[PDB]
Tab-separated table of N, CA and C in Angstrom:
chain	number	residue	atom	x	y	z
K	1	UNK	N	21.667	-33.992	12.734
K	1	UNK	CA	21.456	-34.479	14.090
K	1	UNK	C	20.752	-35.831	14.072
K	2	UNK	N	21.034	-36.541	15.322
K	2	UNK	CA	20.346	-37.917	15.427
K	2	UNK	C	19.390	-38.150	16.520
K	3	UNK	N	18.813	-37.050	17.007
K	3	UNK	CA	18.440	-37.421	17.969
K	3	UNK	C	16.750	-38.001	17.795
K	4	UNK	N	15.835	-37.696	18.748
K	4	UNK	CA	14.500	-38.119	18.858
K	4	UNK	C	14.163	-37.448	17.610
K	5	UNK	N	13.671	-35.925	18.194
K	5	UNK	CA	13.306	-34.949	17.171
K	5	UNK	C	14.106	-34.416	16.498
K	6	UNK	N	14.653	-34.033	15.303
K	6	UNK	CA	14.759	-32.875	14.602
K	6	UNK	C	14.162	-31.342	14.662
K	7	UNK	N	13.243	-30.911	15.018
K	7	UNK	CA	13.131	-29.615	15.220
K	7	UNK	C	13.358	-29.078	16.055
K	8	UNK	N	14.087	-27.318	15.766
K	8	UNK	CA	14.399	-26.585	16.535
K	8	UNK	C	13.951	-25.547	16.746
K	9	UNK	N	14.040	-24.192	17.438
K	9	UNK	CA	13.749	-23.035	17.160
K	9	UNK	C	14.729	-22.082	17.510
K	10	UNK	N	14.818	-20.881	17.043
K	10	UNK	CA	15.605	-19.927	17.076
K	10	UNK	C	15.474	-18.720	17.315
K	11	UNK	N	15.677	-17.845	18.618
K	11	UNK	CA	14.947	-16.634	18.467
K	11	UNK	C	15.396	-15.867	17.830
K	12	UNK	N	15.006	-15.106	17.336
K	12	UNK	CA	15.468	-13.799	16.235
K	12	UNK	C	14.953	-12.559	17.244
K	13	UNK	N	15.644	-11.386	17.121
K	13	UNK	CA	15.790	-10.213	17.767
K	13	UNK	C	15.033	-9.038	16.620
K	14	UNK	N	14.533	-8.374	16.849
K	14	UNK	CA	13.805	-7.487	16.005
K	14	UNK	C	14.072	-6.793	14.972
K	15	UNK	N	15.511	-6.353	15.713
K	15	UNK	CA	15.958	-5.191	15.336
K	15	UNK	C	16.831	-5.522	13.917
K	16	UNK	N	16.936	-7.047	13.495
K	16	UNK	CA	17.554	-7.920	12.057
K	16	UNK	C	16.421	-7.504	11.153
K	17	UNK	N	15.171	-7.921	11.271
K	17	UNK	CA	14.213	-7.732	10.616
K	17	UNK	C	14.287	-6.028	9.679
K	18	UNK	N	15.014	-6.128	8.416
K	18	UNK	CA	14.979	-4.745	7.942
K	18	UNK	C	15.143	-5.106	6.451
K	19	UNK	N	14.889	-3.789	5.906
K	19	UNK	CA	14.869	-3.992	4.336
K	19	UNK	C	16.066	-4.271	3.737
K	20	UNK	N	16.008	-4.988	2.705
K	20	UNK	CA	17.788	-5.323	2.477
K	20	UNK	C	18.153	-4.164	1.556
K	21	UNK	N	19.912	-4.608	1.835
K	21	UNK	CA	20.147	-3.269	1.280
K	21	UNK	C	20.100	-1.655	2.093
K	22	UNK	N	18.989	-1.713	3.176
K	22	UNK	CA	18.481	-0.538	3.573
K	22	UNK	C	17.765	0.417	2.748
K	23	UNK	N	17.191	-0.061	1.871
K	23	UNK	CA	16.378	0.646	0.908
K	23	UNK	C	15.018	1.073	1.666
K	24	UNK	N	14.091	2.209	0.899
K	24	UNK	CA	13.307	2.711	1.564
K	24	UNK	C	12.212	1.632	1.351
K	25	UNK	N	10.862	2.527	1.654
K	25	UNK	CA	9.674	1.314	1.973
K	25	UNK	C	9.008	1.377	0.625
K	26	UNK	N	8.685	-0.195	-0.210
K	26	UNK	CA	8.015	-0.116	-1.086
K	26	UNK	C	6.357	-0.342	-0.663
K	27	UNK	N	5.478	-0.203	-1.289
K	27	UNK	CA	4.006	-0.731	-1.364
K	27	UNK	C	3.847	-2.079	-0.428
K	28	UNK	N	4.944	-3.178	-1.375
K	28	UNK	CA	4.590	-4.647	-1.040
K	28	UNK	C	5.493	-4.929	-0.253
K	29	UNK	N	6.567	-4.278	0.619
K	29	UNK	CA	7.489	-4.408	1.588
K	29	UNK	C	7.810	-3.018	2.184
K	30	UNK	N	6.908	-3.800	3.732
K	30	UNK	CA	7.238	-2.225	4.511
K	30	UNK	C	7.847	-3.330	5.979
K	31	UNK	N	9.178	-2.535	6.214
K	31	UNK	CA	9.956	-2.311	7.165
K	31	UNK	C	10.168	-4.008	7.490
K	32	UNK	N	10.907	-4.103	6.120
K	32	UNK	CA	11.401	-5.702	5.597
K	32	UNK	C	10.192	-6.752	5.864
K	33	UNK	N	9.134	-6.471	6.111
K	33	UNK	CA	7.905	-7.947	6.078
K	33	UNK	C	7.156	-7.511	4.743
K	34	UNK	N	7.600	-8.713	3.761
K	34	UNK	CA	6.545	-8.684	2.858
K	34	UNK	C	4.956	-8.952	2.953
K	35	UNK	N	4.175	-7.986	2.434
K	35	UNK	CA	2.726	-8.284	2.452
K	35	UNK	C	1.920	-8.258	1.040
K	36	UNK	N	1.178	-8.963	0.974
K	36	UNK	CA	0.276	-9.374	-0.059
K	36	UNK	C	-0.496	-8.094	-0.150
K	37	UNK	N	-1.349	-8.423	-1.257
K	37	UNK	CA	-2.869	-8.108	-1.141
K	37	UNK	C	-3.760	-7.414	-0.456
K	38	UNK	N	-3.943	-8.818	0.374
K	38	UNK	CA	-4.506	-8.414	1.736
K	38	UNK	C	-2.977	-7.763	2.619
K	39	UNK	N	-3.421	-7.595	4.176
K	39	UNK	CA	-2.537	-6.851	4.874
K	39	UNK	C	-2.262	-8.502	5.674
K	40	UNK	N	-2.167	-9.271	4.802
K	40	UNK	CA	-1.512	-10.786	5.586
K	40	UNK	C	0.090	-10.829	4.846
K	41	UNK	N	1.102	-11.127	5.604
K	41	UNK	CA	2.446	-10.914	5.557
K	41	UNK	C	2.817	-12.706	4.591
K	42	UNK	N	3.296	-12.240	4.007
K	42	UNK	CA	3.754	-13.351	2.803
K	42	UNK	C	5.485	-14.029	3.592
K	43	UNK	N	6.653	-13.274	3.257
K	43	UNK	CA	7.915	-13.734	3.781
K	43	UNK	C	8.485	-12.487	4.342
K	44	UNK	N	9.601	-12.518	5.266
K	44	UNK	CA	10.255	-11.649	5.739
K	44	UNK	C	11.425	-11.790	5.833
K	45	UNK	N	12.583	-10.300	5.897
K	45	UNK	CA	13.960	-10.343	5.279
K	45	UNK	C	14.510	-10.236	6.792
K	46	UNK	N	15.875	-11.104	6.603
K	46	UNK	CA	15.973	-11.221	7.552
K	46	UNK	C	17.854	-10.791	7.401
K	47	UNK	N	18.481	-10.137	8.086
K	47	UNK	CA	19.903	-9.299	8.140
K	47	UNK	C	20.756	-10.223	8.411
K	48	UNK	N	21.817	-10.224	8.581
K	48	UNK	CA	22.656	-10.957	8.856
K	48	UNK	C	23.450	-10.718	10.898
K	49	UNK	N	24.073	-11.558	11.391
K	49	UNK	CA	24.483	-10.591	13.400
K	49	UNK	C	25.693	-10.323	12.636
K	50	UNK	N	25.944	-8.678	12.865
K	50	UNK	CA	27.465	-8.758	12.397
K	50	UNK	C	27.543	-7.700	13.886
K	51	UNK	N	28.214	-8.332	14.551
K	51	UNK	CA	28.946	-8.024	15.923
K	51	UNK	C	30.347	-6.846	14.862
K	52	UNK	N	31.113	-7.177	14.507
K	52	UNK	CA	31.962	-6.333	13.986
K	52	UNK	C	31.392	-5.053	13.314
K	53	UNK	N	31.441	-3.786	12.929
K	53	UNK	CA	31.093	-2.655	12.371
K	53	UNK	C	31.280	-3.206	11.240
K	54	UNK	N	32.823	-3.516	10.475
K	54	UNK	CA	32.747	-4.072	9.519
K	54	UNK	C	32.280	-5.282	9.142
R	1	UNK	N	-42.926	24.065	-28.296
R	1	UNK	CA	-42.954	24.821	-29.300
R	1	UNK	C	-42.069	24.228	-30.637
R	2	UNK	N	-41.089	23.226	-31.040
R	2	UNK	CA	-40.703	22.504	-31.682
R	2	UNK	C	-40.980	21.144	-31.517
R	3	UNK	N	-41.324	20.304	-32.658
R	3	UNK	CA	-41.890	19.168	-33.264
R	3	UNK	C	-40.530	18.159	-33.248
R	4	UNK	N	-39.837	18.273	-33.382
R	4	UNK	CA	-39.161	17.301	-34.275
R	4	UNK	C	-38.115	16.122	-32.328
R	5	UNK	N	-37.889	15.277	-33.281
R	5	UNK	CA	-38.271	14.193	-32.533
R	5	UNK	C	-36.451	13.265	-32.272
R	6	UNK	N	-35.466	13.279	-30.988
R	6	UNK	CA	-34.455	13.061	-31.375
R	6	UNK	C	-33.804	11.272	-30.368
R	7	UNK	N	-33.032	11.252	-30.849
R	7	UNK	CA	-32.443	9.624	-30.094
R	7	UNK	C	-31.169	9.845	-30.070
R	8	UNK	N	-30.286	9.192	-29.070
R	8	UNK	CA	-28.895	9.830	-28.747
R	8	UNK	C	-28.339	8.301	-28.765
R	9	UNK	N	-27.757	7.872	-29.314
R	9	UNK	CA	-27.250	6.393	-29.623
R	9	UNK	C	-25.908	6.339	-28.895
R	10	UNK	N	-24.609	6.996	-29.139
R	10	UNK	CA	-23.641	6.776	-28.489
R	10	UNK	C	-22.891	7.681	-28.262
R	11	UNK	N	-21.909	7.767	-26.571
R	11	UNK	CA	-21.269	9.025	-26.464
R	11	UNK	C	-19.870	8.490	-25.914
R	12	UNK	N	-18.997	8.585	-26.733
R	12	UNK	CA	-17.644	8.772	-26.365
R	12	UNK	C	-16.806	9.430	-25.457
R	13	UNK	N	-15.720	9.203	-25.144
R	13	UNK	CA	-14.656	9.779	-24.336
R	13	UNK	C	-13.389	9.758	-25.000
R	14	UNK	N	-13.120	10.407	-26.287
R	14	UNK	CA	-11.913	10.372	-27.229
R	14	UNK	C	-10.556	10.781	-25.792
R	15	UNK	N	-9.647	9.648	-25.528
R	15	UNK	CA	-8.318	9.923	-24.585
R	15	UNK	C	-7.060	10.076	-25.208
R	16	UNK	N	-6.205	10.252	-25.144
R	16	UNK	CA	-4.800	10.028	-25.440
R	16	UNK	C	-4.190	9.090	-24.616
R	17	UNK	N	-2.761	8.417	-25.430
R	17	UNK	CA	-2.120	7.563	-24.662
R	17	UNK	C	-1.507	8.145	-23.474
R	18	UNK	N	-1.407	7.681	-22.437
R	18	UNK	CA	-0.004	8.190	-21.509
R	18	UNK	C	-0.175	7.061	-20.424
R	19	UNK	N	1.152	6.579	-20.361
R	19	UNK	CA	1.713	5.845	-19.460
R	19	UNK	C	3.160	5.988	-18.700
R	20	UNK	N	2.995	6.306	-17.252
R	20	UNK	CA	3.879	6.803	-16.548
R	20	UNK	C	4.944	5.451	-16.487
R	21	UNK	N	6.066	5.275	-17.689
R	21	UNK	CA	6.691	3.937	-17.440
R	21	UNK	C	8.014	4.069	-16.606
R	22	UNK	N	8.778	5.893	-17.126
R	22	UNK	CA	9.785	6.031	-16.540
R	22	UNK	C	9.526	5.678	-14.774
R	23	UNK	N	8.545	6.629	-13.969
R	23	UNK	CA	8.029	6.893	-12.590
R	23	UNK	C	7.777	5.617	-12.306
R	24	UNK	N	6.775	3.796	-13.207
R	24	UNK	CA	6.444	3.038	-12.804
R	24	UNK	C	7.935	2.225	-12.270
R	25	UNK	N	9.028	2.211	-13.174
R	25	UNK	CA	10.163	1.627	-13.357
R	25	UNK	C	11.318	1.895	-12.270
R	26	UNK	N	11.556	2.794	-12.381
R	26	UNK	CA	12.906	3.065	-10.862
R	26	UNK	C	12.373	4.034	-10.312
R	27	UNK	N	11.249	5.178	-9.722
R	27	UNK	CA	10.860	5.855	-8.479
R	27	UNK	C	10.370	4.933	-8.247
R	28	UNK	N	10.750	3.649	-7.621
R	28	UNK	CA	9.847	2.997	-7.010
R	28	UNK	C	9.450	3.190	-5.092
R	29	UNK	N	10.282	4.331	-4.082
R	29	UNK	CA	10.292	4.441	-2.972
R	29	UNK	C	10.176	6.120	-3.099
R	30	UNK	N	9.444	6.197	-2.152
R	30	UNK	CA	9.155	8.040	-1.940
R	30	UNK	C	9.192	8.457	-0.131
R	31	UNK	N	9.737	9.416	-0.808
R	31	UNK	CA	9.830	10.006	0.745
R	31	UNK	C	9.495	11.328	1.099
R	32	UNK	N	8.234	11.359	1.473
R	32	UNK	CA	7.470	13.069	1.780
R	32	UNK	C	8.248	13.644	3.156
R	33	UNK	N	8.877	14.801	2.976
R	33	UNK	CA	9.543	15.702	3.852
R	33	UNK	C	8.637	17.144	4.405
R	34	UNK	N	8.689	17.073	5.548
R	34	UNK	CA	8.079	18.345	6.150
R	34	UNK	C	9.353	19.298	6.501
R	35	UNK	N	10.558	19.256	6.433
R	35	UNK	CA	11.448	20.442	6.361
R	35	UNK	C	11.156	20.936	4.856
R	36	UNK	N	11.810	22.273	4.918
R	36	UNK	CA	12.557	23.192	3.768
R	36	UNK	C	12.904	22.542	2.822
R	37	UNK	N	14.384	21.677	3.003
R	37	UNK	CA	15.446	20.974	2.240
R	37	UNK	C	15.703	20.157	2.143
R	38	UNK	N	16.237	19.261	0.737
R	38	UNK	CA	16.897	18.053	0.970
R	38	UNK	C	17.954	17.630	0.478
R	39	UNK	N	18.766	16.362	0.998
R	39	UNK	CA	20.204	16.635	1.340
R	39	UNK	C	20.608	15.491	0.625
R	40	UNK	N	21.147	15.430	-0.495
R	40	UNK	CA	22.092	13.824	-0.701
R	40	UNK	C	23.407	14.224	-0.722
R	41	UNK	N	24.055	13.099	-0.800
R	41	UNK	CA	25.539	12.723	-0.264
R	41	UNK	C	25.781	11.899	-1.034
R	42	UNK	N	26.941	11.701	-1.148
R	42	UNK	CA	28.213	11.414	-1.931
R	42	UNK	C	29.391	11.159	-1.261
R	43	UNK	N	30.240	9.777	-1.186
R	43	UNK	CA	31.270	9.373	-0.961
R	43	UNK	C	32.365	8.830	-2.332
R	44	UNK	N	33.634	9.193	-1.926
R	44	UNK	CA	34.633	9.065	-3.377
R	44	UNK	C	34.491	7.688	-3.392
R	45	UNK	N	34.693	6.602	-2.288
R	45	UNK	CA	35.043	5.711	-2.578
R	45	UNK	C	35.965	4.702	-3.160
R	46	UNK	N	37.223	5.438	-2.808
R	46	UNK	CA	38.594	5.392	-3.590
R	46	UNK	C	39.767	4.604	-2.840
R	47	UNK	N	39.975	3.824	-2.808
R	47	UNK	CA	41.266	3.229	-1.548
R	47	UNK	C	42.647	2.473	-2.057
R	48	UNK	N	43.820	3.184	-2.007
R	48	UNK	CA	44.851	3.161	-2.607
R	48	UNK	C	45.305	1.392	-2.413
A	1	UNK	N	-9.706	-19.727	-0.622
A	1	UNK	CA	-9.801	-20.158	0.796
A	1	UNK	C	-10.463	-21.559	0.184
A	2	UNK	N	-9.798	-22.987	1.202
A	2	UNK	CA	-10.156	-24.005	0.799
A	2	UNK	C	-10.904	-24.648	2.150
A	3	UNK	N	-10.793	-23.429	3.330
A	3	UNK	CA	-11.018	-24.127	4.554
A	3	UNK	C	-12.717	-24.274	4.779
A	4	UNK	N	-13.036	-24.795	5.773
A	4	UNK	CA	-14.514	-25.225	5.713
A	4	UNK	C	-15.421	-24.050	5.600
A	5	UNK	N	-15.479	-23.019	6.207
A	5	UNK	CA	-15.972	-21.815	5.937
A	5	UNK	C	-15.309	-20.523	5.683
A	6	UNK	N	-16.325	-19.983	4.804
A	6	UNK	CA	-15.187	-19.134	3.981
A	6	UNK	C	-15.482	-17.627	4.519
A	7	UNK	N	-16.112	-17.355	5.160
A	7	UNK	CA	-16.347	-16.091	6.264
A	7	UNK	C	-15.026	-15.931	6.397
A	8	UNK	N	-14.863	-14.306	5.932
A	8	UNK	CA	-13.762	-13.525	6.671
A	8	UNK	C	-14.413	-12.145	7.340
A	9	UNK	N	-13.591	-11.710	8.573
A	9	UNK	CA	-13.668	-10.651	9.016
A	9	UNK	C	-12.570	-9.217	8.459
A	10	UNK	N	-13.045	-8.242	9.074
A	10	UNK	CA	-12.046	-7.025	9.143
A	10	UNK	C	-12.508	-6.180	9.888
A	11	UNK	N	-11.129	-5.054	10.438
A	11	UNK	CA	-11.271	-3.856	10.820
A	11	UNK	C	-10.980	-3.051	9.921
A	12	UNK	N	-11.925	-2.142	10.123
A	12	UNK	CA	-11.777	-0.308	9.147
A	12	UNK	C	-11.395	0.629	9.686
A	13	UNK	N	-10.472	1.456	9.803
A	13	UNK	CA	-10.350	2.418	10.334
A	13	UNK	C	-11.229	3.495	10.459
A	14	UNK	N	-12.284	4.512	11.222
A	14	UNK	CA	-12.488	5.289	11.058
A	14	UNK	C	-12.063	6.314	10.356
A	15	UNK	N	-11.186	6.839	10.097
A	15	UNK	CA	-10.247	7.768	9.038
A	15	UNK	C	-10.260	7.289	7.926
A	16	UNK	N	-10.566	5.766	7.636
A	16	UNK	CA	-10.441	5.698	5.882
A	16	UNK	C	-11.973	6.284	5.457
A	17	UNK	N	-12.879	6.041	6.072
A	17	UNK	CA	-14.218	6.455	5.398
A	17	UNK	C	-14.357	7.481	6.062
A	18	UNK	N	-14.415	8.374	4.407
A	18	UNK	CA	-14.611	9.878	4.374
A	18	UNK	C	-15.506	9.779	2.938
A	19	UNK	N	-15.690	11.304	3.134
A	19	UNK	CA	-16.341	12.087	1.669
A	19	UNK	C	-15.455	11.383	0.455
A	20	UNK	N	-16.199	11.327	-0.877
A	20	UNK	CA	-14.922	11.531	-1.995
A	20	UNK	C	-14.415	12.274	-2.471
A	21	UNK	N	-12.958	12.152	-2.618
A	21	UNK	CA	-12.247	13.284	-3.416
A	21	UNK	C	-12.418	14.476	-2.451
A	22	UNK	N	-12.792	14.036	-0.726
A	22	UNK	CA	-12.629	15.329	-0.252
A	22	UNK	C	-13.812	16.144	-0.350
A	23	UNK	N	-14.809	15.902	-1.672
A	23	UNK	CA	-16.176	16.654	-1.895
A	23	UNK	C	-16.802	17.099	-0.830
A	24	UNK	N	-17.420	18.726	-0.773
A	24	UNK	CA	-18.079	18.969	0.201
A	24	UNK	C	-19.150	18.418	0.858
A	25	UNK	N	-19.404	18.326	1.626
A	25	UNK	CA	-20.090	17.768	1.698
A	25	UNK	C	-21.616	18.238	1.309
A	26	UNK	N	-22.950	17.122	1.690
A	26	UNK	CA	-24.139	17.402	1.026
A	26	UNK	C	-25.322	17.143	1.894
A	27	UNK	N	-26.353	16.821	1.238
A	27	UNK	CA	-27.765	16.371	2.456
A	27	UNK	C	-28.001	15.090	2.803
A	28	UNK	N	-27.860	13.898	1.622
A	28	UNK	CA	-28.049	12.628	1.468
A	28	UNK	C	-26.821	12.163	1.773
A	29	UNK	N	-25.703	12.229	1.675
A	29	UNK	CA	-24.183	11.992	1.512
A	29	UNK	C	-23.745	12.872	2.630
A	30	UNK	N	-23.875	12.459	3.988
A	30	UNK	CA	-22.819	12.920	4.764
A	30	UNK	C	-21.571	12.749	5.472
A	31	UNK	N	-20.504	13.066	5.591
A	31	UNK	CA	-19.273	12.672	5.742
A	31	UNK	C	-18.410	11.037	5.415
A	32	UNK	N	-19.001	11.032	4.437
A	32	UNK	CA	-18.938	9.663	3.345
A	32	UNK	C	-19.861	8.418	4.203
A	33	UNK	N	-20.744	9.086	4.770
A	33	UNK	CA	-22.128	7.882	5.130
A	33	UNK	C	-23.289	8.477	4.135
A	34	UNK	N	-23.836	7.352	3.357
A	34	UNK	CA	-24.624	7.763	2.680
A	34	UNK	C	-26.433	7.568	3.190
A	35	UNK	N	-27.203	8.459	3.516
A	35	UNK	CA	-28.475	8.172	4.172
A	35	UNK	C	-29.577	8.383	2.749
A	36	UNK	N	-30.340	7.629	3.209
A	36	UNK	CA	-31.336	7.431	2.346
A	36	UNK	C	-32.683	8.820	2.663
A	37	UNK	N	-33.772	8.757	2.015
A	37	UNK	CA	-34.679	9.507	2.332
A	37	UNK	C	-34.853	9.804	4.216
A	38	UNK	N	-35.424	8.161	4.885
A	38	UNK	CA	-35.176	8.432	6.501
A	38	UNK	C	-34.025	8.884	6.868
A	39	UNK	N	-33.743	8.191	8.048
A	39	UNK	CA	-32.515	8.629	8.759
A	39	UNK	C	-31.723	7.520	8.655
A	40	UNK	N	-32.002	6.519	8.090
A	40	UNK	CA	-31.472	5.139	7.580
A	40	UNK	C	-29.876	5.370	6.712
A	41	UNK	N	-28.711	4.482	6.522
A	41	UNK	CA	-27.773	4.425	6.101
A	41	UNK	C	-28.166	3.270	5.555
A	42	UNK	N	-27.533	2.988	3.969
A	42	UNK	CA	-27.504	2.541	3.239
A	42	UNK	C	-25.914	2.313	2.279
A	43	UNK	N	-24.673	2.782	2.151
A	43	UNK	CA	-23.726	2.598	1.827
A	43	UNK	C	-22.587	3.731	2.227
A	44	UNK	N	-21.518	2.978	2.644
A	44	UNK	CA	-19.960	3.477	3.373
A	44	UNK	C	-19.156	3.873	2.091
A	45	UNK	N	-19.012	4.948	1.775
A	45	UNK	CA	-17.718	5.429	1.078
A	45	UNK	C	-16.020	5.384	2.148
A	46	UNK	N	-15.686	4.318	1.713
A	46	UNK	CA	-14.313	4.030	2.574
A	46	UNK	C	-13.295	3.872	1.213
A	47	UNK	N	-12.061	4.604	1.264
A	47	UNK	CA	-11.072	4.709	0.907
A	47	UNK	C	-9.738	3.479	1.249
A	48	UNK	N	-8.651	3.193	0.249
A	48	UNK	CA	-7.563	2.956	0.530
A	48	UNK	C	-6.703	3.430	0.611
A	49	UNK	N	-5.879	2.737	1.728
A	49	UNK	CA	-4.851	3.771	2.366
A	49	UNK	C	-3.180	2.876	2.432
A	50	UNK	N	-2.453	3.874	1.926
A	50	UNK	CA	-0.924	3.609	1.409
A	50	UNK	C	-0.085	4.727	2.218
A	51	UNK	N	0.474	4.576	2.797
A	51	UNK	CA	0.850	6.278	3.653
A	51	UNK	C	1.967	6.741	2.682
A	52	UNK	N	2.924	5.635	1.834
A	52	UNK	CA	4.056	6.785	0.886
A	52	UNK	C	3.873	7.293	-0.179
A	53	UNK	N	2.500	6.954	-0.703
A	53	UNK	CA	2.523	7.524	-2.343
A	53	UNK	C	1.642	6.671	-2.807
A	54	UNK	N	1.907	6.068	-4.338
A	54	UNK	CA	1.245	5.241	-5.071
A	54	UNK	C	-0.010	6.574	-5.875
């Protein structure tokens, strides 16, 4: 893009936010938000919109 | 009623090895159930 | 932490600090508050908490 700014934002819907794969909950990733250490969230997984079943 | 006179220098904890590597390695997700039973499944996965 | 002050806070759950190991309880050591000779408290037996295992 060319405009003024470059930044955008994007809302994301909740219900993407999940473990990949669908695997169960580990220690350091519960319910796809990775967390550290502490209970401060490091990165989070994010699904793909598949409107189709398949 | 006895004399004699004692000092206790050092006391051990003789262990054995054990390290849970299989359980550390792939059970890595658990899932505690309050029913009876549990159920896995299986698909063939086969398509001509 | 590199920021100007290094004070952190937290919340504890009531439910993590308990007895240890469940131990019955005692006179000095009650329900994992530990009291001194007075009626004074002097150290929290608080637990960590993982809800799947570990």
């Amino acid at each position: 893009s060319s405009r003024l700014f470059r930044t955008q934002f994007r809302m994301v819907s909740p219900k993407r936010i999940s473990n990949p794969n669908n695997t169960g909950d580990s220690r350091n990733c519960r319910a796809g938000v990775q967390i550290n250490d502490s209970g401060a969230a490091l990165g989070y997984y994010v699904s793909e919109d598949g409107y189709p079943g398949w | 009623s006895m004399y004699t006179t004692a000092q206790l220098l050092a006391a051990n904890e003789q262990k054995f090895k054990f390290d849970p590597l299989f359980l550390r390695l792939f059970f890595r997700e658990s899932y505690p159930f309050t029913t009876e039973k549990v159920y896995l499944s299986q698909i063939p996965g086969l398509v001509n």
